[PDB]
Structures are given as C-alpha cells and as structure tokens.
Design a protein around this ligand. Structure first.
Ligand SMILES: CC(C)C[C@H]1C(=O)N(Cc2cccc3ccccc23)C[C@@H]2N(C(=O)NCc3ccccc3)CCC(=O)N21
Ligand SMILES: CC(C)C[C@H]1C(=O)N(Cc2cccc3ccccc23)C[C@@H]2N(C(=O)NCc3ccccc3)CCC(=O)N21
Ligand SMILES: CC(C)C[C@H]1C(=O)N(Cc2cccc3ccccc23)C[C@@H]2N(C(=O)NCc3ccccc3)CCC(=O)N21
Ligand SMILES: CC(C)C[C@H]1C(=O)N(Cc2cccc3ccccc23)C[C@@H]2N(C(=O)NCc3ccccc3)CCC(=O)N21
Ligand SMILES: CC(C)C[C@H]1C(=O)N(Cc2cccc3ccccc23)C[C@@H]2N(C(=O)NCc3ccccc3)CCC(=O)N21
Ligand SMILES: CC(C)C[C@H]1C(=O)N(Cc2cccc3ccccc23)C[C@@H]2N(C(=O)NCc3ccccc3)CCC(=O)N21
Ligand SMILES: CC(C)C[C@H]1C(=O)N(Cc2cccc3ccccc23)C[C@@H]2N(C(=O)NCc3ccccc3)CCC(=O)N21
Ligand SMILES: CC(C)C[C@H]1C(=O)N(Cc2cccc3ccccc23)C[C@@H]2N(C(=O)NCc3ccccc3)CCC(=O)N21
Ligand SMILES: CC(C)C[C@H]1C(=O)N(Cc2cccc3ccccc23)C[C@@H]2N(C(=O)NCc3ccccc3)CCC(=O)N21
Lengths: 189, 188, 186, 186, 191, 184, 191, 190, 189
C-alpha cells in the first residue's frame, strides 16, 4: 500500500487515507462487521467535516454479512450528505444492494463492471424448532431486502423475488435498465 | 463375538445368529440405513419361517436416522406376527419411538432401563428457499412422529409436542405411565 | 450381519436373494450397481417367468450407476417389483418409478424425494461448458423417462424437480412414482 | 456381496464367471487388469470355442493396465463380447471398442465418453520432454487402434478426443465404438 | 522493501522504493491480481489524475493474472481517466495481466526483450444443481466473449482468431506480442 | 478377486496350479518372498516342466528384485517371462532374466528401462557410502543386462541415463525379449 | 498370498504358500524383525524340532534387520534346538538380519550370487535427564560389545576388526561375505 | 535487521543497513528469486539510474535462483539502464542467480574466492491432458534455448557446450567460473 | 528487543540494543546461519569498513552454525575488508559458527571461559537417480576438503588430523579450542 506526500505552503498519506481526505470511501472487500464499522465511522466523520458536500462510495465487493451490510445502509440514509455509489470491477450480494442504496440519481457503474443479485445465504443446525426459527429469520430478512430493493429500483417485490431466486449476473447497462444504478459512467472527453 | 453350538439330531452359531434362531432380533446400535435394512430383512424372514409365532425386538439404541427408523416401523406393522419390544439399557430418539411401536400389550422395559424422547435433529445450509424447504420438511416429519406417538401412547399431540421440546429422560416406570411401554419386566 | 440356517447356511441378505429379493439399501455407486445388475441377471437365469422384488432404502447417488440398474431391469424378462421402505431419494426414487407397471409399492411412512442431478465442473470456460451441457442433457434424459413412467409432463417434472421435493407415500401414488401404498395385512 | 447356492456356493461375481461373464466394473488399475487377464486366460482353457462376455461399467484409468486387458482379449481364441452398462469412459470405452467384431453392445441409457490420455511430468526440462513425448506417442497409439476398430480416421479421432466428448449409446453405434444398442423386449 | 531519502529546499522526505516510483507516476502491478491489488491500483490511478490530468502514467506489469473482475476494475479506471496510461511488461504478463498490457494507451504499450506474454481462456468453477452449473457456465462464457471482444478491439485481430488462439495456453515472445497487437513496441536498450 | 470351482480356487491360485506366477504389482520384499516361494514350490512339483512368469509391474526394490532373479536362475525349470501391460525398472530387468528364447511381450505392452533411484541423508561420509553403494548396484544391474540383451555395458549406461520407453518391437530389437507374442 | 492344494494318498490338504514351505521345514524371515516376527519364527523352530529333531531346518533371510532384542530371541532359539538351522540370504540381509545369517549352523550358511549383505552398529535413542541418557548409552554400547563378540566367534574375525568395519554402513557382495566369514558358500546355480 | 545513523550537512538520517547500502548504489539480491524480489530489484535499478545515469551500480548476489520469468525482469532492466551494473557473487549463485551473475557489465562480473556458482537446466511442471503437457514441454524447452543462447553470448561458450554442461547440476569454484566466462575476475583480498 | 537512548549535549538518538552495538563496531552473529543472516552480517561488515577502514570490528558468535554457502559469504567478506575482525565465542560456536570463529584476525580470536566450541563434517542430502546422488556426494565431499583445507591453514593443524577429528561431533572446551588453534586466547574476567 503506497504512500503519497501532499505539498502545502507537507503531509504524508497512505493512498486510501488520501482518498478519504477527498470524501472517497473504499468498500473494496468482503463485507464483515470490521469493514462495516470502518465504513460507518468514515461516513459519520465525513458528515462532521461537511454536512453539505457529496461523499463517494467506491464498491468492488462480492458482498458478505447482511447485518453488517445494513449497518452501512442505515448510516448512509441517516447522514445529511448525498452518498454517491460507484461500482467498479464487481458488486455482488449485499454489495449490489448497497450500490442501489446510493443517493437518487448518483448511483453509477463503469462500463465493464459486474453486478450480481441473489437471495441471502445462511445455515441452521439442531432441533426442529431451532431450524424453524432460523428459517423464519432468513425468510423475514429476504422480505426486508426485497422490499427495500423494490423501493430503490422501482421494480415490484414479486419481480425481485423471481429474479433473485438463482444467481443473476447483470451488465452495467442491464443494471441501469433494472434500476440498481442511474447511469453507466462513460469515459471522459 | 463368541460362537456357540446347538445340538438336536449339530450346528455352530455366532451368539446373535443364535438369538435370531429363537426369533430374537437385536437393535443394539445407532440406527442408520444398514442397521435398518438388516432388521427389516430379519423381520421378513422370521415371518416366512412362522407367521403365527411372536418375534422379540431387543432395543439398546440412542436412536439415529428417522427415515431408517420408519423402515423398521413400517415393516413391524406390515408383518403378521406380533413384534414384542424390550428396552434394555437405553432407548432414545427413534429407538424409543420404535419401543412404542411394539405390539399392543407386549412393549416392555427392564427396571433400570433409560427411555428418552425429544424432537428430531437436522440441518440446512444454503439459500433462504433451500433452508425453508428443509425446515418445512423436518417440521412435517415432527408432526408425523408426534401423530404416531399419540396413537400408540394414548397421549395427545399437544402434550407430546410440549414434552418432546427439550430432551426428556424417563425411568422405566415413568415410561409405563406415559404409555411408551405396557409393563416393567420384573425379575424372579 | 446375521446368519440363518435352513442343512445350508445363509447370511440374511443372501437368503432374501434365494427368494428373489434384491436389497438396494445404500448410496448408489458403481459397486452397488454392479452387484444389483449381477443379481438381476442371475435371477433371470434361475427363472425367467417369476417375479423379482427390489427393496429400495436409498438416498440415491451416481446417475450413471443408477442407469446401469435401470437398463438391466428393463432388459430382463421377469417383472421387477419395486418397494420403497424408509426412503427413496434422487436416483433411488427414479428406480422406484422404473419398476414393472402396476407393481411399484411404498410402505405408509416411507419418504420419497425427487430433485435435479448434482455435479461439478472446474477449469477453462470451454471445459465448464462441456460439463454444463452434459449435466443438462442428463437432466432431460431423466425427466423424459420419469415422464413416461409417471404419466406427468416433461414441463411439470422440470418445475417439480427444480428444488428438493419431499413426497409422502400417498403423494407419490398420486404423482405416479408408485402404483399403490402397501397397507398392513389381516 | 451376496452368496448364491446352486450344492456349490458362489459369490455372485464368481457365479457370473462360471457362465463366462467377466465384470469390469471399477477404475482400471494394475490389480483390476491382472484379475481380468487371469479370468480371460482361464476361460480360454475351459473352452476355447465358446464366447466370453465382458461387462463394462468403468470410468477408465491406467492406459498401461488397459492395454494388458486389450492385448489379452486379442490374443485368446474365443470371441470376447463387450457390453457397456451404466458408463464406459476413457480406457473403458477403448476396451468397449476392442470387443469382437459385431459383438460390441451398449444398453439404451448407457454413457460412453472418449477423451485424450491424462498424465503428469515434473522436474528438469529434458525430463518433461521425455514424459511429453511419451504421452503423445501413447495418444497416437490409442488413436491408431481406435481408428482401426471404429473405422473413423486418425484425424477425426484426434479432433473428437481433444476435449471430453460424451456420446449416447445410439451415437456410439453411429461412431463405430459399438455395433448395436441392445434393445429390450417391450 | 528499501527506503530511499530525497533532499530538497523545504526538507528531506523518506520513501519506500515503491512509493517513490509513485511520486514519478509509476504504478507497480507486480503480483497476482486480486480485489486488494485492484483497489490499490485504482486508487493510485485516480490520485495521479488529480495531481496532473495531462502527464503520462506508467503501469509496470509483472503478473500471472488473476481475478477477471478485479482486472476489469483496473481496466475501466485506466480508460476513464484523462491521462494516457503506458503499459510496460517486464518479466511476465499472463491471463488478465496480458489483457491489461493490451489496454494501455494507443502507441504506448511496451515490453522488454525477454519478457513473456501469455494469453488463454478464463478459468472458473461450478458446483451444485444442474441449473446452478448452467448459470455459472453461461456466465463464464459471456465473460469470455466480453474479454475476446475487447482484445479484438485493441489488437486489431478478429474475435474468431482470438477464440482459436486463446483455447489453450499460448506463450508469446515480446516480438510475437508486437506482431499480434498486444503491444506496440519492444523496448530496446539505450545508448 | 473371483473364485473358480473344478476343489475351489481363487483365480490367482488356479493360475499357480498351471505353473503361472503373477508379478502384477510394485516389487517390494513381500511380493518377492511370495514369488520366490512359488518358484521353489513349482520346482518341487516338477523340475522339468516350464514355469510362466507374468509381468505387469512398474518395478520397485532392487534388492527384492534380485531375490526373484537369483531364485529364477537357481531353479532347474525354465522360467518364461511375459510382459503384459507394462514392465518398468526392476520389472523390465526381470523380463530380460527369463529363460533364453522364452522371453515374450504382447504387442501393445510397454517396456521401460532407467537407472536405480535412491536417497542419502546426513554426514558427508554417510552420503559417500550411499552414493558408492547405488553406483555399485548400477554397475551390477548394467553388467547383467549386458549379458542377457547382448548389448554393451557402455550402451546400456547411455540408454538408461534418463527414462527410456520402448515398444514391444523395440524391446525385441534391444534384446530384452526374444519375441513379440502375435495373435493367431 | 496364493494357495496350493497338495493331493496325496492320506488326503487333499490346502496350504497357503508359506505354510507349505513350513511343511518342508523352510522358515521365511522376509521382513523387518520386530517382536511379532520373532515370536512366529521362534514358534516355528520349536515346532519343527518336535516334528523331527534330526532333520535340517532352512531359514530364508530377506530382511533389513530390526529389533536387536527380537533378533536375539531368534538367535537363542536357533542355538538351543537340536537340528541344524541352515541360513540362506536371498535379496538382502542387513543389520540383525546379517547377524542371524552368520548364526546358521557351521558350514550351512549360504547366500545366492546377487544377494546383498550389510553390517553396521546398532541404532537407538535416548531422551531426558543426563543420568537417563547415560543409562541408555551404556546399554546400547554393552549391546554392541555383545553383538561384536558373537560375530567374532562365528566369522573368525577379531572383535577389533568388527568394531572398525561396523562403524559406518558396510555393504558386502555375497562373495565378500564368504571371505569375511558371515557365510560359508555362495550358492551357485545347479551345474 | 540493524539500523545505522549518519551525520551530514542536510541532517542526521537513520537507515536500515540495506537501505544504507542502496544509498551507495548497492543492491542486495540475497534470496530466492520470486516476482516480489524481482519487482524490488527492478525498482531499485530504475531509481539508481534517475539519481545518476553515469555512476556504477553494484549487484550483490547470494541466491539459489528461482523464477525464470522474474529473473528475466531483472536481466532486461539491467541491460536497459544506462549505468554499468557490476555483479558480485558472495556465498552462492545458482540457477537464475548464476545467469544474472553472468549478465553483469562486461569486465565487472566478480566472485569472492570461496563463493559457489552452479548452473543447470530450468525446472518446471505439467499436469493434465496430453496436449496441455505438450504445450508446457514446448514452453520450458523454448525457455531453455533462450537461456542457453544468452549464456553463450555472455560467457563466449557455444550453445552446444552449455547444453551439455547444464544437463545435470554443475557446481563450479569461483576460479572455474572465471575460466568458464560466467565471471571476469575472482576478487582477491586487499 | 529493548531500546536505549543516547542523551548527549549534541544529538539525542534512539537505538535498538543491537543497532547500538553496531555503532561501536560490534556485529552480532547470534542465530542459525542462513542466507538472510549472512546478507545482514556482510552488509554490516562493508558499512563498518566505509565508516573507518583502520579500526577493529568485533564479531560476536553464539551460533549452532547452518548453511555452508552462507557461512562462506561471511568468511570471504571478513577476509576481503581492510579492518581486522575480532571473533568472540560466547555461549556456543558450532559447525560453520566455529569455522567463522577460527576465521577471525590472527591473534584476535577469543572465547569466554564456559563457551562451547564444536566441530564436525558438513551435513546434506541427495535424492533421485544414481548419477544425481553421485553429483551431490562429489559436491559435499569437495566442500569438506575446502573447509578442512582452510581450517588447517588457520589452526595450524594438518588436513589429516582435521578429517579424523571432524568425522563425528567433537565438543571442545574454550581451553581445548585454544590448544587446537581455533582461538588464540580464553578471555579471562
Ligand atoms: C445523529 C448523530 C449524528 C448525532 C449523535 C449520535 O447519535 N451519535 C451516535 C453515533 C455513534 C456512532 C455512529 C453513529 C452512526 C449514526 C448515528 C449515530 C452514531 C454520535 C454523534 N456524534 C457525532 O456525530 N460527531 C461527529 C463526529 C466527530 C468526530 C468524528 C466522527 C464524527 C457525537 C455527538 C452526538 O450527539 N452524536
Ligand atoms: C410379504 C409379502 C406379502 C410381500 C411381498 C413383497 O413385496 N416383498 C418385497 C419386500 C422386499 C424386502 C423387504 C420387504 C419388506 C416388507 C414388504 C416387502 C418387502 C417381498 C415378499 N416376499 C417374501 O417375503 N418371501 C419370503 C421370504 C423368504 C426368505 C426371506 C425373506 C422372505 C417375496 C414374495 C412377495 O410377494 N413379497
Ligand atoms: C443378454 C443376456 C441375457 C444374454 C447374453 C448377454 O448378452 N450377456 C451380456 C451381459 C453380461 C453381464 C451383464 C449383462 C446385463 C444385461 C445384459 C447383458 C449382460 C451375458 C448373458 N449371459 C447370461 O445371462 N448367463 C446366465 C447367468 C447365469 C448365472 C449368473 C448370471 C447369468 C451369459 C450368456 C449369454 O449369452 N448372455
Ligand atoms: C495359449 C498359450 C500358448 C499361452 C501360453 C503363454 O504364453 N502363457 C503366458 C501367459 C501368462 C499369463 C497370462 C497370459 C496372457 C496371455 C498370454 C500369455 C499369458 C501361459 C499359457 N498357459 C495357459 O494358458 N494355461 C491354461 C490355464 C489354465 C488354468 C488357468 C489359466 C490358464 C500356460 C501354458 C502356456 O504355454 N501358455
Ligand atoms: C470523474 C468523476 C466521476 C470522479 C468523481 C467520482 O465519481 N468519484 C468516485 C470514484 C471513486 C473511486 C474510484 C473511481 C474511479 C473512477 C471514477 C470514479 C471513482 C470520485 C471522484 N473524485 C476525485 O477524483 N477527487 C480527487 C482525488 C484526489 C486525491 C485522490 C483521488 C482523487 C472525487 C470528486 C468527484 O467528483 N469524483
Ligand atoms: C534345491 C536345493 C539346492 C535347495 C535347498 C536349500 O538350500 N533351500 C534353501 C532355500 C529356502 C528358500 C528359498 C530358497 C530359494 C533358492 C534356494 C534355496 C532356498 C531350500 C531347499 N528345499 C526345497 O526345495 N524343498 C522343496 C519344497 C517343497 C515344497 C515347497 C517348497 C519347497 C528345502 C530342502 C533343501 O535342502 N533345499
Ligand atoms: C527342550 C525343552 C527344554 C523344551 C521345553 C521348554 O523349555 N519349552 C519352553 C519354550 C517355549 C517356547 C519357545 C521356546 C524356545 C526355546 C526354548 C524353550 C521354549 C517348551 C518345550 N515344549 C515343547 O517343545 N513341546 C513340543 C512342541 C510341540 C508342538 C509345537 C512346538 C513344540 C513343551 C514341553 C517342554 O518341556 N519344553
Ligand atoms: C528509462 C525511460 C526510457 C523509461 C520511461 C519508461 O518507459 N518507464 C516505464 C518503466 C517503469 C518501471 C520500470 C521500468 C523498467 C524499465 C523500463 C521502463 C520502466 C519509466 C520511466 N520513468 C522514470 O524513469 N522516472 C524516473 C524515476 C524516478 C524515481 C524512481 C524511478 C524512476 C518515468 C518517465 C518515463 O518516461 N520512463
Ligand atoms: C574494493 C572494491 C572492489 C569495492 C567496491 C565493490 O565491488 N562492491 C561490491 C559489493 C557489494 C555488496 C557487498 C560486497 C561485499 C564484499 C565485497 C564487495 C561487495 C562494493 C564497494 N562500495 C562501497 O563500499 N561503498 C561504501 C559503502 C557505504 C555504505 C555501506 C557500505 C559501503 C561501492 C563502491 C565500490 O566501488 N565498491
């Protein structure tokens, strides 16, 4: 991880910390509780710095913990600044959920980025009533995810259910048509 | 596993095979598909030998596969002879279910034998709809087990549900009172 | 595994085989298939008229090994009865359905399950394609034969095998996988 | 593995061997080959006129062990029928094709697969060269014999074995690996 | 990792050797491409643009390749930014590494004389139900078409030729890579 | 392993009744002891009649191989050697050790010859001892192969330096076998 | 392990090949010498004596050696019994295996032409306190003196030569073993 | 890894011992050659050129070799840059390590008296289908020709002799390496 | 590993204890000799020469030995540089460690009273074809002759005596090492 030195009228930054100085947050790995806590803490801090200016959330993630994902989601919605979401490389599972949770009109993906949507994965072991509890829980968390995706894509709950049943790979352009993003970010002129 | 000799007008038997000659079947281990297939085959054979005479099912088992258990259960009910069930040492899970499935009035347990009843155990991993399928399945299998236990003990489905929620250890005497067995087999 | 004696000594499974009963009681692999195939061919040579009884308590297994058993059942002259006791799943329930017309049974609390075939593929994109085309062609093949023997449509079987589908013995009868639920005697 | 009594007692596979049926039902290694070879030589000594039946349900295996079986089949006087049930892949399908002319069969839903031989090489560049030359020479050898026995060209076999190639029984007949699909009575 | 110290009029700065290369707009892609490596490269590229949107960037490539998806994070970011990104293959560029070598700015894709370039199909895996394997197979095949289409655009070779030539591992010399269109020049040694 | 009845025999034991010995696996001390015991027994049964040694082996222990070799040479009967499938390393050595004019291979059988493999670990003088030993055992093997193929020690050394795969026909030309056993 | 059936005037008996050799007073020492192998060989020797105390016994040796203690179980039993025990080295006799080769009856110790004979010191181990290591070291050294003394008696070589010659691994040809006194003759083929 | 502190006119600067050697244009190739080691050495070489394109660079070699590809990253970068790169074998230079020893600037390839130089063929592996093994075999053989050709150019020995001499492991003394042409001089004590 | 601070009147510096010893021209060879340890020691020796080509260097040795090749990297660099390199065995010097102890500047090779010196043959391994084993055996034997020749030169003992004496592990007291010629004096308190 390289270091960059910025000159003034000189401060040293690791490249990711430097991006954070310009209000860019990197969600570039599997989403676990650690990654969520860091992103949450960055979002809260960037608000305290400036509650008006845009934040940029870079997403290259295969997804991960639903619950950790919702830590990030709730914090994005809570804070005053618009949070732009930009999918580069890949956004899958909770990663593509969070891609869709970006501020209205500021959800992007670069041309060859990969977006995937599916159902949540989990597990249950033990007594029949314990398995029932876990099954009811993961199903309730599927309804919750599907409801919010419906709100933010404009697709129906019924269509999202059908389309998330098995792994569903989308192109950037297909993600735009679906409502997961607003624009495909074309290269500059 | 020792060998014994029978005389008459002489054959060598391993001790378990000799018990089988006197219509005694040993269910003495964890119930898996192998054990079930052997017990099923023994039951069918003993019927062909004599469709009138009683069969004796010895049970010292912690239970095991529900499906394999129901292979034994259905075969017991299907055949013409009465199948006595005798719990010695321990009958737990599907083992105690099968103890209760013995012929009416011929379900026994020795004084210090342990009987335990509980819910079926399982597992599910993967997508939400896959976990749903597995959960619906194990719950349907619970209703099925509870319904048959109700029929054979005389207890209500509601009471069996409550009483199987956690592990429930019973004495032989308590098992009699519950309806899982008919008598505690007293000594000379 | 106990021994029974009638002047001749038999292990219990071999004694069942003397009365034309074959035990399919485990995961279906190439060994189990070869044994069952060999038993079926032998029972035909003993008597080509008399019924054979195929006991099924199996979670299924190899599709290819399953089709060894299937083809041999169809090839031989005797009717092969199929009787599901405990559980018949995957290729086990396929073979349950392959029994002679009108002689496919299940006992009351037996469990029947149907689903799609499972497999794997690893390597280059064209290698994965080959494996994917293969498992899909083997799904069509299984679905076609199940359609023929249950009387259900290929389209319905596809829908119904998409995820694991547990059936009661009675539900299996209604579906056409078996002909009768074998009730207890009098 | 069940026992049948005919009084002489036989394990089911040994009984099949009494009727000149040899089971090739597993991965082909040196053990399996040695057993099959020994069975073939014995059956010849019993009767050099009567047909032998080689059952094949194998994913293949050792090329060299395979050629032990192949050479022994060709050497002995009796015709060796080959019958693919379930699956014949790799060296298994090679041996299926090596059966006596006009007596190579497969049951309707049996699976036949052909591909190139698999191997490995590790060490110095000249050691890898030696191993590479060797496996390539053994590919030419296999392809040449398959060409002779199917009637297909060496060039077509090379193209068709490049990647895994799954065939139906009917497709195997058209290809020349077998002479006929063994239909049931109906 | 060696530290070097630079001297100026406002002070001395200490740099790890790689960070010092980054100060001169040189980015090191020198390992298996995973999501971490991609995120770092992307972040470097975005930063170097903000420093100066006119000046060239130099992407050193010694990589066996790796994640296709992580590779496309780097690719899309190269194309998006204003500066030309030079690509220089030293030692080896294979799989997604050679793809990215070809994605350098037109006329500024280089390889040193004894560098190794390899092209092949993407690798993957699938396990489970037949319809799950179908999905994965369709996906990796669509990703092959996507890679082949872009390689066609940037080498000038046809999609049909790239398909044939990537079927199995295909090792190229630097000179062969030039002829193929993966690079523009073999970088000869100086005077 | 199937049983045949004539008196019940496992298939390999039945081959032994007709003086056929199976060398069908990696050569270790167990396999050698069995083969040696079979050879001594078959001599006691009949010291005139031929013995048939089937070979489908990748080779193995040099020392165990020489147990079989010395016993073949010692006994009165001719021991035919027949390579089916594969004969490599000590397996191809033993193929060559068959009675003069009765060394065969079937058409697609594989014969391979190479140097002996080994290992040494510890002090410099311990490695020296092990190196001298494996080199002396190479000379020994090369000398006997020279005697039985008719090739020179120098040519065998060159030809065994790296793995050398031969066809049955090539093995005949080389002198490892006398004939390729054709089908009638 | 194959079965042979011997057909005679009193019967039809079936033998595993090794048991058949034992019927002709041939004992197989064909593996690593541990306590099991020793107990079997001892039991065979005692039985063959009870069968016939006049007739020769034949001890086949193809062994890399092993337990010294187990080896001395075999040695002492050979010396105790009345019959001569011939020893025949085929393939290899090493460590305690070559010791036992030398322990055969005087004039009846053989090796086939390409058999390998090796002699060396006993191997062992010690771990723990200094006085425990001392005990183990004294023990293995006394056991070396014991082996060397008996080898001296049976080869005719001096204790001091055996010590020098067993210091490192010492490989001998059959012919060299004859010259050394470990065997009496190299068994040459018929003619 | 110890730290040394220097005193000058622009400060008092702390260096890890290896970084201090780099300040005097000395690069340490002291481990198995993998892609990391190559990238570091390449980056050091490019930096030392930018510092001063006239002054000599010193490449210390104590390596058993390693990746051929990574080795050629170092080789090509040495040849590309303007400064002479001296090569000095201390302890051991084997496989790609001895190749790089030979790639030093003409007349400035050294080895200390008891240093060990070894040359052999490249090692590799191949697993899978016959055509896959063919591809890998052709590749490692083409890479052998490539290495042999360059060694021929820099030692002055023929391609045929190098092939024969690299067939199995070949250990050389420093003096034998001089005679062979892998180095120019054995560096005697002062 | 503790830190010491040199508090002077001109320049306060912090040093890890080993780096501080290096400031006084003391090099620690205190572990198994591998290529890393050799490269570090070599680099220290070269640096100390550049600092002052007249002043003595002190090489502390507490090592069980290790790589012969790496050992000869250290040996050759000692002999090459202009300063005398003192060698001081404390605790233990074995294998290549005792070789390097003997390679110290004439008259400046020391050992403390209860230090342990051990000499033996080099250890190695060989696996594969007979000709490969031959090559490895010839190599380790040539390397033994090389070590024995240099030990002979620096102890004053004959090559024949060193061969005999290194055949098996040979433990020496400090005093015995002096008598042998591996060191010049036992450093008394
Ligand atoms: C609506 C709150 C934004 C306001 C309230 C509050 O509820 N929290 C709890 C709190 C803790 C962690 C994460 C959260 C995420 C979401 C919501 C709340 C979260 C802390 C917050 N503070 C703050 O933001 N300070 C700004 C700041 C300063 C320095 C670093 C980072 C942020 C401190 C003072 C205060 O009253 N609050
Ligand atoms: C009892 C018959 C009324 C049921 C019917 C049948 O469906 N099967 C299939 C079958 C196979 C395995 C296990 C089963 C368990 C339960 C029910 C069936 C089971 C076998 C049975 N046979 C039989 O008992 N023969 C006598 C016998 C002799 C020796 C051993 C065992 C049984 C063959 C003749 C016949 O019509 N049947
Ligand atoms: C189709 C045969 C019914 C007729 C024909 C044949 O095609 N095979 C091939 C063959 C081999 C193995 C398994 C098969 C499975 C299915 C179809 C074929 C299979 C063997 C068979 N034999 C036989 O049944 N013998 C009777 C027998 C006696 C005792 C045990 C087993 C079988 C030997 C004599 C003979 O001509 N045949
Ligand atoms: C047709 C003969 C000319 C073949 C010839 C021969 O070359 N071998 C070598 C040999 C050994 C093993 C496997 C082989 C496979 C193929 C060819 C050869 C094989 C043995 C064979 N014998 C035989 O068949 N005996 C009959 C028999 C009886 C009982 C069991 C098995 C075989 C013994 C007598 C004899 O001359 N021969
Ligand atoms: C061309 C605009 C669309 C760029 C736009 C934007 O979309 N992002 C998102 C973003 C995040 C990560 C990686 C990306 C890669 C490609 C595109 C976008 C990427 C950040 C960017 N910013 C910036 O460059 N700031 C300057 C800077 C300073 C120091 C380091 C890096 C960047 C912040 C200000 C701003 O409006 N944007
Ligand atoms: C032919 C004699 C020259 C051999 C002589 C001899 O020195 N041995 C030692 C001995 C043991 C093991 C393996 C050997 C292999 C090769 C040579 C020798 C081997 C065995 C042999 N015997 C024998 O053949 N008995 C016949 C027999 C019958 C049945 C089965 C096996 C052997 C016992 C009686 C006897 O004096 N001898
Ligand atoms: C020469 C007598 C001193 C032997 C004496 C004795 O000391 N033992 C102990 C004993 C046991 C095991 C192994 C030994 C090895 C060496 C010495 C002794 C060993 C057993 C022996 N017996 C016997 O040989 N019976 C005959 C026999 C029959 C069948 C098989 C084996 C032996 C029982 C009768 C008897 O008095 N003795
Ligand atoms: C010698 C010029 C002809 C090379 C040319 C070029 O092609 N590269 C690419 C490049 C990158 C990495 C490693 C390489 C290795 C070999 C060849 C090329 C390599 C970098 C170089 N730069 C430079 O040296 N900058 C100075 C510098 C400062 C600090 C440390 C290192 C270098 C940047 C400016 C520039 O145009 N170039
Ligand atoms: C009498 C000349 C032959 C010495 C000459 C040389 O050939 N090397 C190669 C070299 C590299 C690595 C390790 C070695 C170990 C032993 C011998 C040589 C070694 C280094 C030296 N330099 C120097 O000392 N610079 C001063 C310095 C400053 C800081 C730390 C170390 C040294 C660079 C300038 C120079 O011309 N030389």
């Amino acid at each position: 991880i390289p270091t960059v030195i910025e000159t003034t009228n000189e401060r040293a930054y690791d490249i990711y910390s430097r991006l954070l100085k310009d209000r860019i947050i990197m969600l570039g790995s599997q989403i676990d509780d650690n990654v969520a806590n860091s992103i949450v803490s960055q979002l809260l801090f960037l608000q305290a710095q400036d509650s008006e200016k845009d934040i940029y959330l870079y997403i290259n993630s295969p997804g991960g913990s639903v619950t950790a994902g919702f830590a990030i989601y709730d914090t994005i919605q809570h804070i005053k600044p618009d949070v732009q979401t930009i999918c580069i490389g890949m956004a899958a599972s909770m990663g593509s959920f969070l891609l869709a949770a970006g501020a209205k009109g500021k959800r992007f993906a670069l041309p060859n980025a990969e977006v995937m949507i599916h159902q949540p994965l989990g597990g249950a072991q033990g007594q029949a009533t314990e398995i029932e509890i876990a099954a009811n829980h993961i199903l309730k968390t599927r309804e919750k995810l599907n409801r919010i995706l419906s709100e933010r894509t404009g697709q129906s709950i019924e269509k999202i259910q059908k389309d998330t049943d098995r792994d569903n790979f989308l192109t950037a352009e297909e993600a735009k048509e679906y409502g997961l993003i607003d624009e495909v970010m074309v290269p500059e002129t």
